């Protein structure tokens, strides 16, 4: 992959991005309770609580719109899928370590994309 540009960058850190998260479905035996929206009928009160939702397909669907400029957008999305667990089921819930298995291993693989250097170096000439 010769990226030469700022949008030949994005397009290649948003398909990275998608695998990262693709390959979090065998993580962990709970994780697809992380992949679509909380529906009401199975949590009562949720969005009372919980005002910037967040789940792993619209994660998908913003980096196929090409919404992730940066890392720090990305893992500010991915930091709310850990922050509402901990908040709506209280802390030591048994989902908040697989919020946390998740986000950590999300996190590790972001670094070990090939080329993410130059990703982010041709990400920061907007
Ligand atoms: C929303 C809080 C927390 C969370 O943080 N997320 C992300 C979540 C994502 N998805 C789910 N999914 C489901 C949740 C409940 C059920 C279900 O069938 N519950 C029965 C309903 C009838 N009742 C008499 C007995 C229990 C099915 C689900 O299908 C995938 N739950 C989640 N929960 C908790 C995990 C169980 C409760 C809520």
């Known amino acids: ?30 994780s697809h309770v992380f992949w679509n ?34 890392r720090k957008d990305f893992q500010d999305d991915l930091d709310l899928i850990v922050e509402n667990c901990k908040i709506y089921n209280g802390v030591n819930h048994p989902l908040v ?6 986000h950590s291993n999300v996190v590790k693989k972001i670094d070990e994309i090939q080329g993410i250097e130059k990703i982010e170096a041709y990400l920061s000439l907007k």
């Not at 009928?41 to 919404?67: D, S």
């Open 97 to 102: 370590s697989v919020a946390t298995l998740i």
């Open 1 to 30: 992959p010769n990226i030469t540009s700022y949008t030949e960058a994005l397009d290649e850190f948003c398909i990275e991005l998608q695998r990262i998260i693709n390959s979090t479905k065998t993580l962990h035996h709970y």
């Open 37 to 70: 929206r909380v529906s009401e009928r199975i949590a009562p009160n949720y969005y009372n609580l919980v005002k910037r939702p967040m789940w792993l397909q619209l994660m998908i669907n913003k980096c196929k719109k090409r919404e992730y400029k940066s």
